[PDB]
Amino acid sequence: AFLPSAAYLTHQQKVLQLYKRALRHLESRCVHRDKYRYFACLLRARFDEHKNEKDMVKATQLLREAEKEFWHGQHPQPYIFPESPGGTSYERYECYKVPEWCLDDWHPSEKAMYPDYFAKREQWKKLRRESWEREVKQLQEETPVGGPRTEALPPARKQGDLPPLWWHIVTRPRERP
Amino acid sequence: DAPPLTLEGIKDRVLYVLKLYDKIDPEKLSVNSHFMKDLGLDSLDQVEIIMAMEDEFGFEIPDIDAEKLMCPQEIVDYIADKKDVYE
Amino acid sequence: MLKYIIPTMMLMPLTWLSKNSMIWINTTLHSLLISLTSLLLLNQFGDNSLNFSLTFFSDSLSTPLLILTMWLLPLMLMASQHHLSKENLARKKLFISMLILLQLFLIMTFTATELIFFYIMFEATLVPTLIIITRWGNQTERLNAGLYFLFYTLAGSLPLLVALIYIQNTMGSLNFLILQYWVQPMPNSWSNTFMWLACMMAFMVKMPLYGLHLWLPKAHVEAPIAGSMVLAAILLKLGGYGMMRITLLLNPITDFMAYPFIMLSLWGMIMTSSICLRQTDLKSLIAYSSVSHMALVIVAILIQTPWSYMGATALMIAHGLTSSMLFCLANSNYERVHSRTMILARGLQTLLPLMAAWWLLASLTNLALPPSINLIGELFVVMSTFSWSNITIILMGLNMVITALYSLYMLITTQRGKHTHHINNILPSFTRENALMSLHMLPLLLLSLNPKIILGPLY
Amino acid sequence: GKRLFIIKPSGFYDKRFLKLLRFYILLTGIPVVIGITLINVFIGEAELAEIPEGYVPEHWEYFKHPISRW
Amino acid sequence: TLRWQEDPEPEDENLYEKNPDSHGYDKDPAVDVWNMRVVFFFGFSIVLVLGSTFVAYLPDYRMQEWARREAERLVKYREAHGLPLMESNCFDPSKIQLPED
Amino acid sequence: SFPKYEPSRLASLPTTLDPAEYDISSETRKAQAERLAIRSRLKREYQLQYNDPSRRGVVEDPALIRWTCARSANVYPNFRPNTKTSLLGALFGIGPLIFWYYVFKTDRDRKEKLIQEGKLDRTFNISY
């Protein structure tokens, strides 16, 4: 469907996604732990009934009818974790995730009260500006004709070389500022 | 309120949750054990184990990331990078 | 009014004789001094107008507009002194000269005793605004906007000239006091129909009336900040003042004549407001908000009830100040992000807290939060129009939704949400910008205490 | 403990603007309100009286507050 | 081919790098400080404060307060001589000649 | 059995119920590979222009400028007056105006006729 590395979802991935969503919806509909455990064992037995199959078309519309049945028997209000999207606490503290580059706009009066941290930040900035050239040199040659086919990035190859395009992942803001 | 967590505690809790599983044994369970190659389980067992840690730690791990959490050290790595350990 | 014209004519060599680094400070100091001396026009009466000579007079209607004009000019000089820092010294002095000439033209136009002097000065206000728009504008197609503005104004105002000369040749004079004492009723004839059309269409063009408002969404966008402010906060009120003066002379035909035009606003200010629900350009959103407020002004003036007049002038002053502040906010954000796209810059509260506070205050004053002047004016207009007819409350009430439904929307997308990743040139707030926005906002909150000086000539 | 540096935008500029705005407002607000309360307390308000026969007062005598009269 | 000769796009001027305490007025600090002083003196200290003092003390604006005082006399007259509170005719009806029909 | 999902303009079909997602033909495979390559090239261009230490400013997004110019300035050069646009302009441009004018003229005529015969309660109405 829409994945970063693969261009499609295989049959195994579809089955596992259906199993996980079915377990989540069954846990939502079966609030008490023991009823949920019993019906999870029943659902695992039902899934293992058709595990050993040799015809791909049979697995195809078996998965179609299973997804239709799961759509019919879903919870209208499924349980959502607080940090998951759609939850009550989703992307809340993202309002407080101030990016690091704003620290480059501070006054020298308020930069003098954190000397050591700003010295270490200067060292990190120097490391970034000396690693950018060799990281783009690494990414230029490794890229084949027509650009990269997948979104996966090559890792660090030579000793002393940082991975390409690493700044906006390593220096991303913390979860709890 | 909201006590911090350490990486040693993270692997202790993950091995604690793993060691209560009835399709696993507490003898050859280690932190560098592949689930199907070195331990011998199923893919259904893999997704159900991922769901077990999702219920344990209280947050949802997406399926695209869930397919690759294949060893207990990799699960500890994903929890470590999610929860910003060693601050 | 020769105590204010001569200070501006002396400000002209003051900006033609200063050094290359001292033009802004001297012009700002002396224009603020003139703004301080501008308060002497408040010696008004509840029954008489303050007349100085045969050519200049000022009642309680033109006085707030004069104070707003020569208070806005120093704000204009502050707002337009950064993006012209790369310009030539001669062109910078020419820009200040055009602004000073425009202020002199406006303060001569607002105190015109006779209507022909008002008309010629009203058309004379075209030249510096057109020059500023077609010279210092940023976008490519500013020539089209300048041509549209000039031609809409001239095609409106030439039948106004013909009607004014016809009235002067018919009765004998064009003094406003004499016409107040020598007024004659106009019967329901087709000659009086075309007389009303010729006397009105210029002001309906410059208000602008819905249908003829197309010169606003262009000329308010590609113009610079000073041209945008002089288009949004003065000239529409110039047309409104002209319509207020003229509508005395056209009774009782208007009582059966203004049925389409009023309703040409009474629906239009709905759907134009709906355009602000689906606008990708922030300056166009501000311009369409100005269109809606001027349509409300059109309805209030055209129903010619007293409470409508008070609401019209109060909403005029409040909307002029609010639109100038919003245009300054748009100019500051455009300077920071180099794009007028509203969806681009997001989450500015996490980077700019004081600017977010100013955004919140400007948006709150735009949605008529009591007890600000805008709520007073719009409430008086709603009372007057409900006195006119019942069902029109719906045609105002739904607007009460949609205005909020865009203004807070303009507050949300530019301020609230996850900030943009690739934008990393958001500098901290300049002291010049904060000073300009406080000078825009604090007079409004201070006039909220004592609004009795800006409620019209018949309070 | 484990204190972490809260990453925040630079708060010097807005605080300096607010401080100098308050200073420049108060530097003239305090003397004018001192003058106003000294006019109210020492100089004081006017008193209403009927017009005597044969007196034509000036225009500023038709008002009450001394600042208004001035 | 190549188009007409033209300079590349000049970058935006970050004013805070060349001056840590600049205020978006001018390059040199002294004229910038003078501009700050003149705007905050003649914009807040001079026009706003004295303007609030002036508008707070207009000399009995539009004679409106005086009208209330006049009302304080007039009903005092009309509650003494037994006259009705307010006549329904603004002018004297004895000095009006209606058009005969 | 089950109640089959009927999609509407405001209720889209679920992605897992789509038959086209369950197609394993080769043409769908090359289409997915081609769109993945296009997305990867655009992503690579973005994070190349994004992680540059020398750059301090706005990364230009051509798609956003394209969308704004398509919404704002490219609507009139690609307009042809035909019967559909004429009918939609006559239904929406002047219809509400004449309807509102007629209902307001009727209401004001009724109010004036009621007032001039002295039946409307206007005893305490002295503000207008």
Side-chain angles (χ1 to χ4, degrees):
Chain A
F2 204 86
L3 326 168
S5 266
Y8 81 109
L9 282 169
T10 186
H11 197 82
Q12 201 186 137
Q13 288 152 13
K14 286 181 199 297
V15 168
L16 292 199
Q17 280 185 353
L18 166 66
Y19 177 75
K20 184 187 166 189
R21 277 140 40 98
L23 264 283
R24 280 306 172 194
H25 278 250
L26 189 66
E27 195 179 359
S28 68
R29 299 273 303 175
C30 295
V31 195
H32 290 294
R33 297 304 300 179
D34 302 349
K35 188 165 109 145
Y36 150 75
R37 192 78 259 160
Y38 170 70
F39 283 122
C41 270
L42 267 182
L43 188 46
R44 200 263 192 255
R46 285 180 63 181
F47 252 106
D48 217 341
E49 258 181 34
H50 270 287
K51 185 171 96 162
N52 315 63
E53 201 61 44
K54 272 84 185 174
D55 183 323
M56 270 314 101
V57 194
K58 222 176 321 312
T60 300
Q61 79 307 24
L62 266 172
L63 258 282
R64 185 187 318 277
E65 71 76 20
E67 194 82 14
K68 288 167 91 134
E69 177 268 357
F70 165 73
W71 177 255
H72 171 69
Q74 67 171 354
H75 206 310
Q77 208 180 27
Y79 174 58
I80 295 287
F81 292 88
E83 262 85 9
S84 174
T88 82
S89 179
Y90 165 58
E91 68 177 0
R92 174 189 288 169
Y93 302 110
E94 287 262 326
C95 85
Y96 294 123
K97 293 179 187 177
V98 162
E100 47 92 14
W101 62 76
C102 296
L103 297 173
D104 304 300
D105 284 18
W106 278 37
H107 203 261
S109 150
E110 57 197 359
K111 274 184 177 182
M113 81 195 208
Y114 303 119
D116 326 291
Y117 180 72
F118 273 126
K120 301 180 296 189
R121 181 176 165 80
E122 208 274 334
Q123 285 158 34
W124 273 93
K125 282 160 73 174
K126 183 178 65 61
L127 174 56
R128 190 266 295 276
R129 79 166 41 81
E130 301 216 350
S131 186
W132 160 253
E133 40 267 31
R134 294 152 301 111
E135 87 178 0
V136 74
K137 175 55 210 76
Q138 170 151 348
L139 202 34
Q140 174 45 279
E141 171 265 350
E142 213 82 28
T143 305
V145 58
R149 249 160 304 281
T150 89
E151 216 181 329
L153 256 56
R157 292 282 156 80
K158 210 70 59 60
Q159 197 265 329
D161 204 344
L162 300 181
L165 319 159
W166 65 276
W167 187 254
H168 280 117
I169 299 308
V170 170
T171 89
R172 72 163 182 254
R174 310 185 301 268
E175 181 245 351
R176 284 296 155 83
Chain B
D1 39 358
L5 260 282
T6 87
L7 61 100
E8 318 257 339
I10 294 289
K11 44 192 71 63
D12 259 330
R13 280 177 67 201
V14 169
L15 269 190
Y16 204 94
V17 178
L18 264 291
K19 257 168 45 44
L20 306 186
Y21 196 28
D22 286 293
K23 267 170 91 178
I24 214 154
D25 65 271
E27 286 313 60
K28 66 160 167 182
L29 191 45
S30 206
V31 309
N32 326 314
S33 312
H34 199 290
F35 275 120
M36 301 66 88
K37 294 302 140 283
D38 314 335
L39 209 39
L41 299 128
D42 207 356
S43 53
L44 260 300
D45 200 284
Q46 176 62 231
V47 47
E48 197 267 282
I49 277 194
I50 281 316
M51 171 295 278
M53 260 55 68
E54 285 185 41
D55 268 338
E56 166 74 32
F57 277 94
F59 78 105
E60 182 178 3
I61 294 174
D63 159 70
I64 320 88
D65 279 339
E67 294 225 317
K68 299 315 170 299
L69 317 172
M70 202 65 108
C71 87
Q73 253 284 321
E74 211 56 15
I75 304 161
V76 164
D77 162 37
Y78 198 85
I79 294 314
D81 273 325
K82 164 72 211 93
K83 294 299 163 66
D84 303 335
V85 63
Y86 154 73
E87 62 295 340
Chain C
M1 284 290 303
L2 211 48
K3 65 176 74 71
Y4 300 118
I5 286 173
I6 309 186
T8 314
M9 263 147 182
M10 222 45 58
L11 252 203
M12 248 325 308
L14 200 145
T15 191
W16 257 128
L17 293 193
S18 304
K19 314 171 186 61
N20 96 333
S21 64
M22 310 302 263
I23 42 185
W24 296 119
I25 292 93
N26 297 321
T27 37
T28 306
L29 169 133
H30 281 279
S31 198
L32 283 162
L33 280 183
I34 296 321
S35 206
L36 169 63
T37 62
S38 67
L39 282 170
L40 310 182
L41 285 151
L42 287 176
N43 186 26
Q44 307 284 331
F45 316 108
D47 48 331
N48 202 9
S49 66
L50 197 65
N51 311 355
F52 313 112
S53 64
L54 300 156
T55 323
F56 307 123
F57 91 107
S58 64
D59 57 342
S60 296
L61 173 63
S62 65
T63 300
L65 289 166
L66 288 150
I67 296 163
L68 182 56
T69 297
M70 41 196 167
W71 176 245
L72 201 51
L73 191 91
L75 265 43
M76 282 195 178
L77 289 178
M78 311 215 68
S80 71
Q81 66 176 328
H82 166 75
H83 84 97
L84 292 190
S85 87
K86 70 106 167 178
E87 274 269 18
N88 193 13
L89 168 61
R91 285 197 291 280
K92 217 186 306 180
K93 281 176 169 168
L94 264 175
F95 189 85
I96 303 174
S97 301
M98 301 315 188
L99 285 188
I100 273 163
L101 203 80
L102 196 34
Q103 190 215 246
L104 184 54
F105 282 3
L106 290 165
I107 67 166
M108 207 150 37
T109 317
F110 274 116
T111 69
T113 283
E114 318 149 304
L115 287 177
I116 179 59
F117 194 67
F118 160 70
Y119 160 71
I120 171 175
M121 259 337 285
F122 157 86
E123 264 190 20
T125 42
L126 271 178
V127 181
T129 316
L130 163 87
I131 283 170
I132 282 170
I133 282 170
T134 60
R135 180 71 175 188
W136 282 278
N138 210 267
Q139 282 301 317
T140 288
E141 269 305 310
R142 61 188 197 269
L143 316 104
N144 210 353
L147 266 169
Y148 258 95
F149 166 57
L150 163 149
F151 261 106
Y152 267 15
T153 289
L154 281 159
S157 71
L158 290 181
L160 181 76
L161 160 68
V162 178
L164 278 162
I165 301 305
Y166 185 78
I167 280 174
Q168 202 269 358
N169 283 352
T170 297
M171 153 197 321
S173 182
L174 281 168
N175 191 329
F176 190 67
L177 308 156
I178 296 300
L179 255 295
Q180 263 184 354
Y181 301 136
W182 281 20
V183 69
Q184 293 270 322
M186 305 325 212
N188 312 9
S189 74
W190 299 118
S191 306
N192 301 120
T193 287
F194 282 117
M195 197 107 83
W196 194 95
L197 251 65
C199 281
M200 225 46 90
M201 281 325 307
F203 307 123
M204 321 295 258
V205 154
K206 206 165 278 267
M207 211 66 48
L209 185 72
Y210 171 69
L212 306 187
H213 71 285
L214 261 187
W215 71 271
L216 262 202
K218 292 175 278 196
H220 268 189
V221 166
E222 323 196 22
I225 174 64
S228 298
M229 281 195 288
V230 75
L231 265 189
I234 315 289
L235 295 191
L236 326 172
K237 288 97 206 179
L238 245 194
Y241 167 71
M243 192 165 64
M244 247 165 218
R245 293 317 208 211
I246 282 303
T247 182
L248 153 74
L249 273 46
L250 302 177
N251 278 323
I253 179 167
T254 318
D255 291 339
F256 97 107
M257 181 45 108
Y259 274 101
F261 286 98
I262 283 171
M263 292 196 78
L264 198 46
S265 298
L266 270 191
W267 179 242
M269 77 169 138
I270 299 307
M271 53 148 90
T272 51
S273 304
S274 294
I275 298 180
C276 328
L277 276 179
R278 288 290 300 276
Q279 265 300 315
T280 70
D281 169 305
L282 164 64
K283 248 156 176 185
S284 293
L285 191 136
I286 303 171
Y288 279 126
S289 82
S290 277
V291 165
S292 80
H293 287 313
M294 291 334 307
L296 263 158
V297 162
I298 276 163
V299 175
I301 297 179
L302 272 175
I303 60 173
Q304 54 173 1
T305 88
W307 287 69
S308 78
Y309 273 40
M310 321 211 154
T313 169
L315 189 140
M316 270 187 189
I317 304 305
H319 151 259
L321 270 179
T322 311
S323 83
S324 176
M325 172 140 189
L326 278 186
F327 265 107
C328 289
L329 259 178
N331 189 47
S332 76
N333 257 351
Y334 159 69
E335 197 228 332
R336 264 158 172 81
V337 316
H338 276 287
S339 174
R340 286 200 310 273
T341 313
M342 190 144 76
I343 208 74
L344 179 68
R346 291 182 306 273
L348 286 174
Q349 187 150 0
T350 74
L351 322 168
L352 254 49
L354 193 57
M355 211 45 68
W358 292 123
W359 262 111
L360 170 63
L361 274 187
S363 298
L364 283 193
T365 49
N366 199 14
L367 53 95
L369 178 66
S372 78
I373 309 287
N374 211 303
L375 195 272
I376 299 167
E378 192 295 334
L379 199 70
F380 284 171
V381 170
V382 166
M383 300 324 108
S384 60
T385 47
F386 193 74
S387 180
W388 188 56
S389 169
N390 295 327
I391 314 110
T392 187
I393 183 58
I394 291 171
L395 274 181
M396 311 275 198
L398 178 136
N399 189 24
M400 221 57 59
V401 169
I402 299 193
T403 295
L405 264 190
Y406 66 77
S407 39
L408 290 181
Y409 158 67
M410 151 185 75
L411 190 63
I412 283 172
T413 313
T414 59
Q415 305 304 306
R416 315 206 152 190
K418 183 54 176 291
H419 65 92
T420 312
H421 295 165
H422 51 88
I423 295 170
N424 43 358
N425 60 342
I426 301 292
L427 305 176
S429 302
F430 289 116
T431 309
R432 168 179 43 85
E433 284 177 0
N434 288 329
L436 163 77
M437 305 206 157
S438 43
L439 284 181
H440 266 109
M441 181 46 38
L442 289 183
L444 188 61
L445 304 192
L446 275 176
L447 271 283
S448 296
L449 300 167
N450 202 0
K452 79 180 189 287
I453 74 176
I454 55 174
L455 286 169
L458 71 169
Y459 148 71
Chain D
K2 207 62 59 185
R3 315 188 286 158
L4 299 191
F5 173 53
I6 325 285
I7 314 117
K8 55 175 61 56
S10 95
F12 185 72
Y13 297 97
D14 62 320
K15 188 47 84 154
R16 186 178 56 190
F17 162 72
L18 288 180
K19 270 182 61 179
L20 202 83
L21 173 64
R22 272 167 291 151
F23 171 58
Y24 264 70
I25 280 295
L26 286 187
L27 193 48
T28 325
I30 299 170
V32 71
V33 80
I34 283 313
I36 278 302
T37 189
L38 283 193
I39 281 300
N40 171 42
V41 165
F42 270 64
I43 280 288
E45 281 166 30
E47 194 186 8
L48 172 60
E50 285 93 26
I51 177 64
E53 158 45 41
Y55 201 98
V56 184
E58 328 181 27
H59 54 280
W60 56 270
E61 283 204 1
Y62 287 109
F63 310 118
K64 192 205 307 305
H65 219 270
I67 301 287
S68 149
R69 291 162 74 92
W70 191 64
Chain E
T1 167
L2 168 79
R3 290 136 300 116
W4 78 106
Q5 274 97 301
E6 194 89 42
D7 311 1
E9 271 305 90
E11 330 97 325
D12 203 289
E13 181 84 5
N14 43 237
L15 195 36
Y16 288 122
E17 309 296 299
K18 214 62 62 193
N19 243 7
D21 64 273
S22 177
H23 306 272
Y25 280 135
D26 166 292
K27 295 313 151 173
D28 322 80
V31 52
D32 163 50
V33 164
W34 207 339
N35 204 355
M36 226 162 95
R37 278 209 172 96
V38 68
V39 62
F40 274 8
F41 198 61
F42 292 86
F44 293 112
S45 303
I46 276 299
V47 55
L48 255 190
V49 171
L50 291 182
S52 54
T53 304
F54 196 91
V55 190
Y57 285 122
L58 261 73
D60 170 324
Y61 190 37
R62 311 205 79 177
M63 282 162 296
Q64 186 265 324
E65 168 63 66
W66 165 89
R68 174 58 81 95
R69 201 147 54 233
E70 191 69 34
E72 182 259 309
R73 208 62 48 85
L74 254 291
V75 56
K76 185 51 205 60
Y77 214 81
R78 263 179 276 225
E79 272 319 90
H81 300 346
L83 212 53
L85 255 290
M86 212 195 68
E87 314 289 277
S88 39
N89 302 329
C90 202
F91 312 113
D92 212 12
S94 147
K95 320 196 310 287
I96 295 303
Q97 174 155 350
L98 278 160
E100 311 305 6
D101 202 9
Chain F
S1 169
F2 302 146
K4 326 324 299 173
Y5 198 83
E6 296 284 331
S8 315
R9 297 226 285 141
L10 298 324
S12 68
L13 205 70
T15 173
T16 55
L17 292 180
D18 272 39
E21 196 209 284
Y22 286 163
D23 251 342
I24 41 155
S25 66
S26 154
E27 49 263 10
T28 55
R29 297 310 191 209
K30 331 171 321 313
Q32 281 163 351
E34 160 95 342
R35 65 176 45 93
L36 173 63
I38 279 185
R39 195 180 72 217
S40 187
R41 184 166 40 83
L42 295 177
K43 186 74 59 165
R44 175 65 46 83
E45 287 189 337
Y46 167 62
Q47 55 207 347
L48 266 177
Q49 273 187 351
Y50 176 45
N51 302 297
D52 201 13
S54 76
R55 176 200 55 91
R56 196 188 193 278
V58 176
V59 168
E60 276 108 320
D61 195 313
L64 203 47
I65 313 170
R66 202 163 300 123
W67 173 53
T68 53
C69 194
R71 281 280 294 268
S72 70
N74 210 6
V75 58
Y76 193 54
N78 205 79
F79 155 69
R80 312 177 295 108
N82 49 356
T83 178
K84 185 174 186 294
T85 314
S86 301
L87 249 54
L88 291 190
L91 178 56
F92 295 144
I94 41 185
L97 287 177
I98 183 73
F99 157 70
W100 274 116
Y101 173 64
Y102 257 94
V103 66
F104 261 61
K105 184 172 91 73
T106 301
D107 172 79
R108 279 218 55 83
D109 156 80
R110 206 258 302 157
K111 184 208 268 293
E112 185 70 34
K113 197 151 298 310
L114 260 299
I115 273 178
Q116 285 278 6
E117 297 171 41
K119 333 194 231 157
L120 199 76
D121 182 71
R122 219 178 50 166
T123 309
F124 299 95
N125 196 359
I126 53 179
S127 294
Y128 70 123

